[PDB]
Design a protein around this ligand. Structure first.
Ligand code: F7M
Length: 231
């Protein structure tokens, strides 16, 4: 490994992200003025918890499909064994979705893009998950204050996936090497772009894991009762 390799890694991660980012940031930004009316919000608040679960499931499986397309474009990732790829995605794909959410979050009015328009947390009322919804909003809010560039999101979410602390990895050392190369690529790119100051503002160690845990615990509860997810 060396610095020209590290530069090509940055270019390459950031390219995979652009190809798998789901919606272009500029599309998400321009859609900010498209907000659910009070009548639309009400129509959402009236759905059963089951219908909202269906809609959130569909929303998430579609976000996860881009994250899997992202991983599969990653340099080091396809060279990892079949088991390690599965262990990393199972543990990290939802964490990556939680990070990616900040692009579709508008801090000025605390709304998120969901099914074609922006709406506030109250849109999700019928779920009966207001503690967890409001943690997810807070997490998005605090990432949103960093004003992440696409390439920064690209590198940070790559680091979210390639984490050698996942239990059940068989080639731990190989995942370690790719993790440390990504961490170094991230630092390097921050220096190139005079953005070192964001390292201190990243979510503390374990805030993401624990939020994702609580998120998935709740999905598993809806799933055991209305199994809408397949595989
Ligand atoms: C903060 N926050 C919360 C939400 C939704 C997620 C689903 N929910 C659940 O899974 C649970 C919540 C708890 C219990 C089960 C259901 C309910 C709450 C959300 C969506 C977005 N939107 C995009 O990322 C987005 C990005 C793209 C792109 N590119 C395209 C479309 N949307 C942004 C911020 C968000």
């Amino acid at each position: 490994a060396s610095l020209t390799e590290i530069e090509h890694l940055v270019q390459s991660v950031c390219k995979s992200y652009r190809e798998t980012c789901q919606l272009r940031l500029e599309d998400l930004l321009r859609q900010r003025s498209n907000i659910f009316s009070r009548e639309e919000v009400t129509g959402y608040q009236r759905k059963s918890m089951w219908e909202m679960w269906e809609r959130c499931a569909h929303h998430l499986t579609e976000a996860i499909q881009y994250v899997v397309e992202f991983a599969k474009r990653l340099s080091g990732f396809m060279e990892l064994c079949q088991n390690d790829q599965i262990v990393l995605l199972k543990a990290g794909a939802m964490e990556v979705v939680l990070v990616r959410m900040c692009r579709a979050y508008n801090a000025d009015n605390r709304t998120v893009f969901f099914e074609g328009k922006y709406g506030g947390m109250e849109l999700f009322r019928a779920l009966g998950c207001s503690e967890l919804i409001s943690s997810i909003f807070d997490f998005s809010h605090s990432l949103s204050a960093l004003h992440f560039s696409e390439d920064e999101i690209a590198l940070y979410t790559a680091l979210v996936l390639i984490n050698a602390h996942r239990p059940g990895l068989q080639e731990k050392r190989k995942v370690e090497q790719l993790q440390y190369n990504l961490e170094l690529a991230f630092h390097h790119h921050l220096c190139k772009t005079h953005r070192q100051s964001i390292l201190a503002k990243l979510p503390p160690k374990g805030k993401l894991r624990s939020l994702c845990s609580q998120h998935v615990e709740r999905l598993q509860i809806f799933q055991h009762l209305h199994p809408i997810v397949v595989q």
